[PDB]
Structure formats: C-alpha cells, structure tokens
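Why predict the complex rather than its parts? Because the way molecules touch one another can change local conformation, and only a joint prediction can capture that. The input here totals 921 residues.
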Amino acid sequence: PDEKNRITSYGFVENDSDLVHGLLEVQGALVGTLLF
Amino acid sequence: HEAGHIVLAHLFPRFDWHAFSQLLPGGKETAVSVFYPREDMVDQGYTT
Amino acid sequence: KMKDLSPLMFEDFVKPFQINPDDEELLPHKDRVSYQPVDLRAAPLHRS
Amino acid sequence: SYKVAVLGAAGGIGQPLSLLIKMSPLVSTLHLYDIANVKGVAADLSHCNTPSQVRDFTGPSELADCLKDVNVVVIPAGVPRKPGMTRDDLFNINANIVKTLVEAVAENCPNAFIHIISNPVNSTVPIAAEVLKKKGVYDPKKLFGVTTLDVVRANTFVSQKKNLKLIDVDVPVIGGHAGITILPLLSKTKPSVNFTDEEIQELTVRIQNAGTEVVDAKAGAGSATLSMAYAAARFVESSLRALDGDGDVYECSFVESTLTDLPFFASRVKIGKNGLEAVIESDLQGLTEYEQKALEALKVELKASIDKGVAFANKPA
Amino acid sequence: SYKVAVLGAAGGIGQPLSLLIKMSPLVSTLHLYDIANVKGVAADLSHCNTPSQVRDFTGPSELADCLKDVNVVVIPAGVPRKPGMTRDDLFNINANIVKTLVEAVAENCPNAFIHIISNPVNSTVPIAAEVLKKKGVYDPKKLFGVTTLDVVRANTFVSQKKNLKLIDVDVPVIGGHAGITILPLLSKTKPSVNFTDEEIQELTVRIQNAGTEVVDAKAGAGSATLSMAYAAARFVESSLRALDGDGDVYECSFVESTLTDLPFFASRVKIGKNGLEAVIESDLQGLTEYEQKALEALKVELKASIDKGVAFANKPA
Amino acid sequence: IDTNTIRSALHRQTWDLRSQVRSVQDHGILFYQIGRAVAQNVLISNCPIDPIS
Amino acid sequence: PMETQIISDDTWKLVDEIWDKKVEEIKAEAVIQIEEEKKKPQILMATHFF
Amino acid sequence: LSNGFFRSNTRSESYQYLSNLFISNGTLLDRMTKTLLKKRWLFSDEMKIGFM
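Output of the joint prediction:
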C-alpha cells in the first residue's frame, strides 16, 4: 500500500521508541572489541 | 466551498456520516458542515 | 441525489488488513523491513 | 595541497584517470604529460570548476620540468593490446617506456610516490626497482604496484554472488596481477559469510580470468580503460591520504616485501607519510588447503615473471 | 533508485559520461545503448564495485527493450567533427540520429526526462520537440537542452580572473549553446565583485570562444570529451535530484520558455518532480546596456537556429 | 497450590474488569506483541512476560 | 553515504549463541518436562543409626 | 547535533539482524499468531510449548 495500513500514534510504540532513544543516549554518553 | 467539502465527503465509500450543512449560520459570513465519525473508528482508539 | 448519478468511486482507504482465524497457512512477507537509515551528507569540499 | 604527476595521461587509461584525479579534494596541481595529444586533454580539463590546477608538458624536453616538487608519480603509460602482436614485444615496449619514465623520475624527483601501472606489472615493478637501484636513489618504501583492480573485481563478484551490500564487502587478494597469480582470500572476507567449494572455485576462476573476459568482450578494441582508471584513482587517493598523515591507510599493493621467498609480492600493506610503513602479516597464514596449493602453484609462475623482469631490466645498452 | 538510459554511450562523450553516471549515489540501473561497441563498455563498467547495475542493448531492434521503466533519457549521440566535413552534412547526420532516437523514446517511454547533448543543441532541441509533437506525447516540461558547459566555463574564467575561490563562483548564462548566443551575466555574479569594462569584454569573448579554442587546441582530434561529459553528468545528477523531491533544484538549461518572443531559450530554470516547475524571470531584468545589446544581437541568431531546426524536423519522408 | 492457581491469582491483581468489551479489529498489532514477546523470551532470560491478548 | 560497518560480526555471533542456547533449552524442556515415578519419604534414613 | 546519524544506522543494523532472525523462524510466529487468534488469552507456558 502507499503506507495505507499503519497504526500511527498508539500505545506501546511510543514507549518502545523512547526506550530505544534512552538506551542509545546512555550508551553514547558513557563511551568515554564490542563496538567497531 | 461547502459543496466541494460535501462532494469530497460523499465520493468516498467509508467517510463519516454527513449530518447536515448550513450556509450563513446565524448571520455569520461563513458556512459549516457536520460530520460524525463512525463508531468503529472511536472503538479502535487509534488512527490509520 | 448522487444515487442515480453514478460518480467515480474512490477506493477504500481504511479497509483493515486481517488474518484468517484458523486457516492453517504460511502467510508471506516481502522479505524485509521497510525502514531506510537516515544518512544524507554531502562529500567534503575541495582544497583540503 | 599535494602535487600529482601522471606520466602518460593522453592514452587510453590516462584521460579518465586524469579526469578522476582532477576532481578529488586532495589534488591542487597536476602535470599531464605524454609524447603527443596532451595539449587537448589539459585544455579540456582546464574548464572544469574544480580548484585543482592543470599544467601539461609535451616531449622529453619538458619532462625535466614536469617532475618538480612532485609528491606522487603516476605511470599509466603503455600501449594497449594490438592485433597480430605477442607478449614479448608488448613486454619490451612497455618496459622501455617505464624505464624512461622511472629514469626521468630518478633524475628529477627521488622522493615522490611511484605508481607503476604498465602491463605486465608483475615483471614491471622489478624493472622500476632495478633502474632506481642503478642510480642509488632506490627507496623500496616509495614504489608500489597498482593491484586494486583484483580487489575491486573480487568485491563485485562476491557481493553479486552472496548478495551482500557492496560497500561493506572487501576481499583480500594476494600474489600478483597476471592470471593465475591472483589468489583471492575468500576465507578472510568481511562481513563473515560461509562459502561452499564450488562457489569458491568459480569465484576464483572468474577473478583470475575477468581481465581475459573483458579483453575478449571488447572484440580486440583494447583493454579495460574505465575500471583501470577507477582502481588507479582509488590507489592515488589512498596514497594522497597517506601523505596527509592518516593513520589507517590500508591497501593491497604489489611491493618488495619479504613474506615469501619472492622479492616482490602483492598483499595488504599499511602506508604512511614516508611510504610503506607496515605489511599486514595476518594474510599469509590461516589459509585452507585450497589457498595453500593455489599459492604454491602461483609461486613458481610469479618467480618466473619476476626473473624475466629483472633479467630484461639488466640487459646491456 | 532510478534508471538512466544513455543513447550513444560508446562515442567520445559517452564513455566518460557513462563512467561518471555510474559513480552517482542515486543511479540503480544503467541502460547503455549504441549501434556498435557497447558490449565492451558494459564489460568495462560491470566490474566496478558500485551497486548501480549495468545492462547494454545493441542495435535498434533491442532499442525497444532499452527504454522500459527508464526515468532519465540521456542523448549524447552524434558523430564528432571530421576533416572535409561541412556544417550541413554534420547537422543532417546528428539530426537524423537524434530524430530516430526521439521517435524511439516517444514510442517506448514518453514520460522520461530527455536531455539533448548533440551539437548544436540550439537547433536540435526544436527537432526533438517537433518529433515529440508528431506523436502527441510532447511534454514541454520534460525536455531539456544541456548548456551547463557555458556556465562551468564562465565560473572557471571568472574565478581565474578575479581570484575568487572557485567553489562559490557562479555566473548566469543566457541565450543558447552555440557561439555568440551564449551571454554570461557578469553583472549578476556571486560573490559580489566589481568588474571593469575591458575585463567584461575579454571575459565575454573568452566564454563565447572557449569551445572553438578547445577544438583548435586538439588540432582536429575531435571536440571536448571530458568537460562536456562533466557538464552532462552535472545536469543528469541535478535532474535525478529533481526526481528525488528536493525543492531547490535550480539549473541553467535551453528549454521552451516564453520569457521572450523566442519559443526556446537558455535560462535559469527550477526543476521539480514532474519536470520543469519554474523559470527564473528575473534574469532578463536588471541588465546593463552591454547585456541589452548583446541580447538584441543574439536574438536573431538564436531565432535563425531554431527556425532551421524546426524546418528540418518537419521535412517530408 | 498448582500452577493454574498462581496464574489465576496473578491475573486477578494486575488486570482491570471492564464492560463494553471490544477486541482488536486490525490484526497487525498482534504481530508486534508476538515478536516482542518472543524476543523478550529468548533474549532477556531474566525478565517477565506479561500475557498477550 | 558516509556510513561504514557497525558494531560487529562477533557480537552477532554472541547473540546468536544466546538465541540458540535458549532455543535448545526450550525445545528440551518441552519434551522431557514431566517424568515423575514416585516420592517415598525416607523416614528410615539408616545412615544416621545403622 | 553531529550525533544523529549514528543512532539511526545502529537501529538499522538491529532491524536487519531482527529481520534475518525472524525470516528463518517465521513458522514459529505464524503458528503462534494462529494460536493467539484461536484462543484469546495466552501465557508463557504456551510460548515454551509452541516454540516447536
């Protein structure tokens, strides 16, 4: 579809996005082998 | 303006219910339609 | 009024994608996710 | 802010190579030079709105003024394949051209990066080494053999077969740059993918005979002139990055190294400001039986090629 | 992720233009086409480790399969300059070739961007327009004339003269792409720099005669083959960015515009998703008396060229 | 006390009784929950899994 | 593009090992989960006296 | 903010690995979705049973 069947702005996807963003920020701010 | 709104509302298989449409409501130089979304969309709790 | 006018009907936009409740079948994928990573940056300029 | 001199920039490979060198953010001045038809190439490249200056020199008379302040010497001069003519006469003409060019470089600029392109480079890099030795200015750390075409072809074939992303794929290649001597290290390919035996066999023969495939696909119209320019431009930009002081200039070149009994060998090297800084020692061990027997097969042919080159470079005048 | 088809990618301009198109980060499929010697070009370009795939089609029989799903059509076809050959027979050969190619693209893919490179493009764009009109598939917003080379030459000469840093220097160019009709707008050059009288005179004559300087510098070896490929690649990249949805795609092209009485005119345009979106109307107001009488002088010459083009394009079969 | 008694006791504390019951009319958020639960099961072997409905 | 490869091809092997380990444990524990034969109290633990 | 193009590609590789792992074991989620459509409520013991 032309993206016609997505489920924008509902419950758990926002929490998942916030959790991933927070995890990424925590990982990046504390970098001061695992990572290339 | 109102006729175009009504036409593009009623050109669709599953748009909201068109209650009515009034030109110059109470002397104001404007116009208004009333559309009531279907109950399934309310029960869904999200938008597509 | 448009019942006997036969307008050009729009396609349905909000028809729900649904799974058969008990039809045992491997429903397919394309084979991927559709997300594209955000990487837009021009090449560095000359005289370096 | 470096200076690059292409020796033979009016032939087949020379014009696209100059076109690619001009448009790089590292080159600022460039001497085109060939025995003929170098005025038009410089006139054509003088209109592009890139700040890399273009000057050109015609004939051996101005070759003395061509190699002043030069940091990188590019030598793509050499006649392409012609009808009715064999390996021996091409060896002689290309060898004579590279003798004159490296002798001009040794007379003018001993301290410039030397890139030898003319074919066969397996027996041509030793010629350049010998004619640099004869003047007492031989620097083994500043003389390379452009062998990036095998790496590019290996990456292309591997990413086409295994269906991987083309930028991420890089395949180590050792040996030389003539047919059988090119051994791709398919067991050391990143990203990690498992290969079969038939796939490795077909990839190896395709990599070894891709140049033959192109020269028969052209129906005798010459050799590879766009992929050769691509690989030469990649190696030139890598060498220019090495001159910048960049600490991860890793390439695959045919240089005088002591990994095996052969004096010259193509492998992964790490280039620095002064030229060769290290040679990657992780490539020659860890091989399977396939790469082992392929290496011991190509060793004698590479030795014969290097002996032919060093013997032809030492003939009396 | 777009498809580009080069019609005539085995001539002088075609091979460097195809090589530059291959290195673009937006091309995903490339359809080379020429009457002969296109297998070798595809063999050369099939080994580069770039995810833009390369396919070639030989002969007008397979030209019908060349134009499937093609978004941008590039036409650099046309024989270079030959000794003993006058203007009219050259125009006949190039015009017949472009007429057959425009008939082919009209039959196969009428919703693709059309770029005309064959010289003179002043009398060739009307030929393509009339041929597209004859099939009822003409779109005036999706047919361009490549005159970017004049802009590049103007920028290079102005940055060389005024000692400005060449990256920011852009000079508007109006008229066409043949000699006197090219008028650089030196009074609207950014960055803002003050010019004298004789400097403007010599810069204008140099910009107008840089093409003939190129063709006499080569001593009859052809025309510009690296700068023309540069300008064509720049315009192709800009058109591909226009298809990508960028809202600041501004170029200088020879298109059908009504800013003057002339149907076709080279000026600054803004390209969108559906082709031409806007024409910069402010280019013709604000000129001094020099540019005014230059436009008055070039109008009749451009009108004659366009009339000759339309006259040839409607000749009976 | 068997497994079922503990499960029914846990279900009665972290679940809210509700009238005018309606289920999901678009299958496709079901796959989201299924994938997240499978990933949370196999990968993070020290975290709970709330029931899917 | 400016983006070269990221975290590894080695920690992907680590997470694949974790996935495979948990998958085999689940597969094993879904078959041999219940084998109970008897539970007799040892109210005569003889090693204490005899 | 020179730190916006790094997280995106990391999530891209995470999505690619998740896609590659889910594609091979697609039958597990397919039968499991059929089960969830069949019986309305669902627990982790049913996870471990239906992993086959």
